[PDB]
Amino acid sequence: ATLYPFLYIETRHIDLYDWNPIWKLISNLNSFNFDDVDHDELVNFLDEKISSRKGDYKKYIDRVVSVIDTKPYTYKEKVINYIKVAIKGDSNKFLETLLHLLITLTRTEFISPIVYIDEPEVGLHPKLAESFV
Amino acid sequence: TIESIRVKNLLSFDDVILRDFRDINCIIGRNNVGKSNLLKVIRYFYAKLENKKVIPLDFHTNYNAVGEITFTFDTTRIKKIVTSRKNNGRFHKHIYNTLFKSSSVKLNFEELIARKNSTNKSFFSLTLTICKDDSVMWSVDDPKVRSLL
Amino acid sequence: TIESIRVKNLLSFDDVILRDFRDINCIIGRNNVGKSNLLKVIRYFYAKLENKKVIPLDFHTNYNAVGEITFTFDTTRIKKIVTSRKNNGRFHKHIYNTLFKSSSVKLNFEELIARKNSTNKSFFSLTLTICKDDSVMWSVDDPKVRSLL
Amino acid sequence: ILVDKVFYEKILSVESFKENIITQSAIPKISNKEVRLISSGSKIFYAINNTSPHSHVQLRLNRFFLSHIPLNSAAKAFVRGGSYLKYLEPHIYGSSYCRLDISSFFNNISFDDVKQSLSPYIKDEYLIGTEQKLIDAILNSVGYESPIRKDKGMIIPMGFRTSPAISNIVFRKMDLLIQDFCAKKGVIYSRYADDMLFSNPRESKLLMSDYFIDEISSLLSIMGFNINQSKYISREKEISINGYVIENKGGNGSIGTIRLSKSKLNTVLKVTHALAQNIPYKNICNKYIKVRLKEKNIKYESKKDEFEKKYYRDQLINYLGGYRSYLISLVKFHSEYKCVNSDFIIQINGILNDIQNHIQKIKKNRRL
DNA sequence: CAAGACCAATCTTTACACTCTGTGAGTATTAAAGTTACCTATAGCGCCAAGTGCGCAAAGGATGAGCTAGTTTTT
């Protein structure tokens, strides 16, 4: 299952405000170990970057955590947060981005997914479908 | 049976007029936003006809102060039905009093006969105006006419 | 920092005034429609403060022509913060331009010295008026003041 | 659009004032030795020389600068796509008609109003050193110090190329105010140059009351404009404006009609009758039309009795073609909007056929 | 004769300062990053140098040719 993932995309009833398939595809197709990043070191770096007094962002984060106490982040959530903080921004366009990202990322890895797309031409001009292909 | 639809300074319209409608009118194009805007304009007009509280549409430019929607109805068959001497009913007389009463009492005895009873087509025009302060005005100040239409 | 809320001729209100708010306020009663109407009034006022297109509220009776929503904010702490010879910032000097001033420039040198007492409270009032034609009027014609509030 | 120093350096002033920029010299104003003083009745027209640095700058400003500033849709004069027919069209739905005029429209335009209107579209910077600004340099090419009107200072004169666009830009604010006022009353308003037309579709006497005139005067007093009390017309169910007749018998959901009076077409009918009665072309072109070939305009004698005849033939055929173009413009307007009487359509179709036949006969006679 | 009613956009947001890290009573008090950021374009005709011009409007041969110009509105 982890070597040959299966991805299903529905084009008619698609939620453009959800990017979960993109995040899953990015997380699965990575060649980095995100566990080597020290949380304390990154927090210290951010605190030194934004401070009118040494040790102010750390206090704010600690006060927030003391009342937002919930389950710890999983590995996938951590890598998603790192990707989001690294990138600069968050029907046909969504599918094109999915296909292009799948082709680009699956070039230096031995994971070969399988993708099923249902009715890619829903609500599209014929020239738009030709341009997509 | 609408004949003319005119939109001025609303959404993505500056001055757009649609006429010469047929039975199987078909709409194609690349700009889907225009089709959506036309549908929204029609739905807004028909919601304001039935006295429903809806959000007024936006303006194409802010250097004007009005937005007008004009509808023309071909009231020819109904006039022939009502004005006939054979039909004596409550609904026919009410329709005559609502639609064809005001426009017919201002004519002499020459234009009514042999000038509007042979082949003429009767039209009814209704205009809806949206102001800058989100105010809605009608060209005809009678809810009964709007309800009947 | 908000004291008075007044509603005249809207929904199920003839003339209702709420004041003397505490840290914790509990609302009880069997008339849930009144609570829902109060929530709707507050949400409508705060949506109009942020320049959002929303449906105007209905009138309690049609023998009037206006519907008023009045809000009063306590600005003592902000006045003390801004008008001190200690804070020289872009945001400090903008609140005095928008929220304050135009009320101290009209005062002489004897009212200002008497308005600096430690037992003085400063109030700001906003009024929203709804007309019969679904028009919206404000007592203060300045979007910057509304955005800051 | 935002004009900066480079835009005036390259686009607005490419070669006319390039000498005065490198030398660090102020841009001169238009002197009294470069403008004519044409007179027509009680009207004075200022004509600039066709070979002058300011004329090219004015043309470039008209084409590249004074063509992108937004206007108001109530203004249908001196704008692409506007016409007198579009100025009369919206009022077919009304039952009461009112007409107003502005006295001395171009002479009462304040120069500071023009400067304030054009300021947001021009960058605030010094074009030449620290003596002249870009806005002042641009504005010195549109004004003129009238010797006969020294009391009023310097104004934008009629007859220049950039005057209509400036007038529309200045009067956009007043058009917005008047349109906002008329919207609440349910009155359709249109403006052509300095003429205002108001139409009421409901059955009321608002347009015949002094309250409307007082309100319009109060609105126009902000910018210093006045109405002309000798050209005030207010009628019901029928109005005539320079031969254009707009009629609407009244009633809910009633659509009016637009036609032309018989006096409007009198000259062309007379010309057609004279041509059908075999009247000499000299008399036709001198009496009915106001075209005359003066002997001073003749340059070289060469041959005598061959250029006058062809000149008169060309003038007659040009007049007929222009009037045919006007009539078919009316026909196209009808096809677009369908607000023209059917009998008038039949009459103009017959007139067009007669005019075309006369043109063909003239061409055949000239060929023979 | 005077008169309330004096446009939209001008790029967009967002936000405490200090020594004290929690609190502030000016006679008249925004501003600096970020992200963009817009397009204007040509007239008689032909020729040779090919657009930055020159010549000519008799051909043609470098200054006799010859030489018109629509309607309506504002005004």
mmCIF file with all atom_site columns, N, CA and C in Angstrom, chain A residues 83-104:
data_model
loop_
_atom_site.group_PDB
_atom_site.id
_atom_site.type_symbol
_atom_site.label_atom_id
_atom_site.label_alt_id
_atom_site.label_comp_id
_atom_site.label_asym_id
_atom_site.label_entity_id
_atom_site.label_seq_id
_atom_site.pdbx_PDB_ins_code
_atom_site.Cartn_x
_atom_site.Cartn_y
_atom_site.Cartn_z
_atom_site.occupancy
_atom_site.B_iso_or_equiv
_atom_site.pdbx_formal_charge
_atom_site.auth_seq_id
_atom_site.auth_comp_id
_atom_site.auth_asym_id
_atom_site.auth_atom_id
_atom_site.pdbx_PDB_model_num
ATOM 1  N N  . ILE A 1 83  ? 6.319   22.851 5.232   1.00 0.00 ? 83  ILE A N  1
ATOM 2  C CA . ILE A 1 83  ? 6.126   23.176 3.820   1.00 0.00 ? 83  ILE A CA 1
ATOM 3  C C  . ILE A 1 83  ? 5.365   24.488 3.674   1.00 0.00 ? 83  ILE A C  1
ATOM 4  N N  . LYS A 1 84  ? 4.320   24.681 4.484   1.00 0.00 ? 84  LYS A N  1
ATOM 5  C CA . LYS A 1 84  ? 3.544   25.916 4.412   1.00 0.00 ? 84  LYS A CA 1
ATOM 6  C C  . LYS A 1 84  ? 4.396   27.129 4.762   1.00 0.00 ? 84  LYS A C  1
ATOM 7  N N  . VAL A 1 85  ? 5.224   27.020 5.802   1.00 0.00 ? 85  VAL A N  1
ATOM 8  C CA . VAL A 1 85  ? 6.076   28.141 6.175   1.00 0.00 ? 85  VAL A CA 1
ATOM 9  C C  . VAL A 1 85  ? 7.213   28.330 5.181   1.00 0.00 ? 85  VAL A C  1
ATOM 10 N N  . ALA A 1 86  ? 7.506   27.318 4.361   1.00 0.00 ? 86  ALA A N  1
ATOM 11 C CA . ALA A 1 86  ? 8.556   27.441 3.357   1.00 0.00 ? 86  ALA A CA 1
ATOM 12 C C  . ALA A 1 86  ? 8.049   28.030 2.043   1.00 0.00 ? 86  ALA A C  1
ATOM 13 N N  . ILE A 1 87  ? 6.830   27.685 1.631   1.00 0.00 ? 87  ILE A N  1
ATOM 14 C CA . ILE A 1 87  ? 6.278   28.171 0.369   1.00 0.00 ? 87  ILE A CA 1
ATOM 15 C C  . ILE A 1 87  ? 5.767   29.594 0.550   1.00 0.00 ? 87  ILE A C  1
ATOM 16 N N  . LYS A 1 88  ? 5.474   30.270 -0.561  1.00 0.00 ? 88  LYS A N  1
ATOM 17 C CA . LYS A 1 88  ? 5.068   31.668 -0.536  1.00 0.00 ? 88  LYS A CA 1
ATOM 18 C C  . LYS A 1 88  ? 3.565   31.874 -0.677  1.00 0.00 ? 88  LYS A C  1
ATOM 19 N N  . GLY A 1 89  ? 2.805   30.836 -1.007  1.00 0.00 ? 89  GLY A N  1
ATOM 20 C CA . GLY A 1 89  ? 1.373   30.999 -1.180  1.00 0.00 ? 89  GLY A CA 1
ATOM 21 C C  . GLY A 1 89  ? 0.630   29.702 -0.966  1.00 0.00 ? 89  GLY A C  1
ATOM 22 N N  . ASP A 1 90  ? -0.653  29.837 -0.649  1.00 0.00 ? 90  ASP A N  1
ATOM 23 C CA . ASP A 1 90  ? -1.524  28.687 -0.440  1.00 0.00 ? 90  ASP A CA 1
ATOM 24 C C  . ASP A 1 90  ? -2.450  28.500 -1.636  1.00 0.00 ? 90  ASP A C  1
ATOM 25 N N  . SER A 1 91  ? -11.612 24.434 -10.847 1.00 0.00 ? 91  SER A N  1
ATOM 26 C CA . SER A 1 91  ? -11.747 23.010 -11.131 1.00 0.00 ? 91  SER A CA 1
ATOM 27 C C  . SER A 1 91  ? -10.612 22.519 -12.023 1.00 0.00 ? 91  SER A C  1
ATOM 28 N N  . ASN A 1 92  ? -10.460 23.157 -13.187 1.00 0.00 ? 92  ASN A N  1
ATOM 29 C CA . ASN A 1 92  ? -9.390  22.779 -14.104 1.00 0.00 ? 92  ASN A CA 1
ATOM 30 C C  . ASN A 1 92  ? -8.018  23.058 -13.503 1.00 0.00 ? 92  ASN A C  1
ATOM 31 N N  . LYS A 1 93  ? -7.864  24.203 -12.834 1.00 0.00 ? 93  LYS A N  1
ATOM 32 C CA . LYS A 1 93  ? -6.572  24.564 -12.260 1.00 0.00 ? 93  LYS A CA 1
ATOM 33 C C  . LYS A 1 93  ? -6.143  23.569 -11.189 1.00 0.00 ? 93  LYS A C  1
ATOM 34 N N  . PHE A 1 94  ? -7.085  23.129 -10.352 1.00 0.00 ? 94  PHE A N  1
ATOM 35 C CA . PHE A 1 94  ? -6.769  22.162 -9.305  1.00 0.00 ? 94  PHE A CA 1
ATOM 36 C C  . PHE A 1 94  ? -6.262  20.853 -9.900  1.00 0.00 ? 94  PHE A C  1
ATOM 37 N N  . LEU A 1 95  ? -6.962  20.336 -10.914 1.00 0.00 ? 95  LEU A N  1
ATOM 38 C CA . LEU A 1 95  ? -6.553  19.082 -11.541 1.00 0.00 ? 95  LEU A CA 1
ATOM 39 C C  . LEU A 1 95  ? -5.208  19.223 -12.245 1.00 0.00 ? 95  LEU A C  1
ATOM 40 N N  . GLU A 1 96  ? -4.995  20.348 -12.936 1.00 0.00 ? 96  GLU A N  1
ATOM 41 C CA . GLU A 1 96  ? -3.716  20.573 -13.601 1.00 0.00 ? 96  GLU A CA 1
ATOM 42 C C  . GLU A 1 96  ? -2.576  20.631 -12.594 1.00 0.00 ? 96  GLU A C  1
ATOM 43 N N  . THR A 1 97  ? -2.787  21.323 -11.472 1.00 0.00 ? 97  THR A N  1
ATOM 44 C CA . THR A 1 97  ? -1.765  21.382 -10.434 1.00 0.00 ? 97  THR A CA 1
ATOM 45 C C  . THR A 1 97  ? -1.482  19.998 -9.870  1.00 0.00 ? 97  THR A C  1
ATOM 46 N N  . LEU A 1 98  ? -2.531  19.207 -9.628  1.00 0.00 ? 98  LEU A N  1
ATOM 47 C CA . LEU A 1 98  ? -2.337  17.850 -9.125  1.00 0.00 ? 98  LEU A CA 1
ATOM 48 C C  . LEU A 1 98  ? -1.483  17.026 -10.080 1.00 0.00 ? 98  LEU A C  1
ATOM 49 N N  . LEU A 1 99  ? -1.842  17.023 -11.367 1.00 0.00 ? 99  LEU A N  1
ATOM 50 C CA . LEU A 1 99  ? -1.109  16.207 -12.332 1.00 0.00 ? 99  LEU A CA 1
ATOM 51 C C  . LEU A 1 99  ? 0.332   16.679 -12.484 1.00 0.00 ? 99  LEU A C  1
ATOM 52 N N  . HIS A 1 100 ? 0.540   17.995 -12.573 1.00 0.00 ? 100 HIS A N  1
ATOM 53 C CA . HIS A 1 100 ? 1.890   18.519 -12.738 1.00 0.00 ? 100 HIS A CA 1
ATOM 54 C C  . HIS A 1 100 ? 2.754   18.215 -11.521 1.00 0.00 ? 100 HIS A C  1
ATOM 55 N N  . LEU A 1 101 ? 2.198   18.379 -10.319 1.00 0.00 ? 101 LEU A N  1
ATOM 56 C CA . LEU A 1 101 ? 2.947   18.077 -9.105  1.00 0.00 ? 101 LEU A CA 1
ATOM 57 C C  . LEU A 1 101 ? 3.277   16.594 -9.018  1.00 0.00 ? 101 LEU A C  1
ATOM 58 N N  . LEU A 1 102 ? 2.326   15.730 -9.390  1.00 0.00 ? 102 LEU A N  1
ATOM 59 C CA . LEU A 1 102 ? 2.586   14.296 -9.371  1.00 0.00 ? 102 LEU A CA 1
ATOM 60 C C  . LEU A 1 102 ? 3.701   13.923 -10.338 1.00 0.00 ? 102 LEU A C  1
ATOM 61 N N  . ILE A 1 103 ? 3.686   14.498 -11.542 1.00 0.00 ? 103 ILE A N  1
ATOM 62 C CA . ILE A 1 103 ? 4.733   14.188 -12.513 1.00 0.00 ? 103 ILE A CA 1
ATOM 63 C C  . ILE A 1 103 ? 6.084   14.708 -12.034 1.00 0.00 ? 103 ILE A C  1
ATOM 64 N N  . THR A 1 104 ? 6.117   15.930 -11.497 1.00 0.00 ? 104 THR A N  1
ATOM 65 C CA . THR A 1 104 ? 7.388   16.535 -11.107 1.00 0.00 ? 104 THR A CA 1
ATOM 66 C C  . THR A 1 104 ? 8.004   15.833 -9.901  1.00 0.00 ? 104 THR A C  1
#
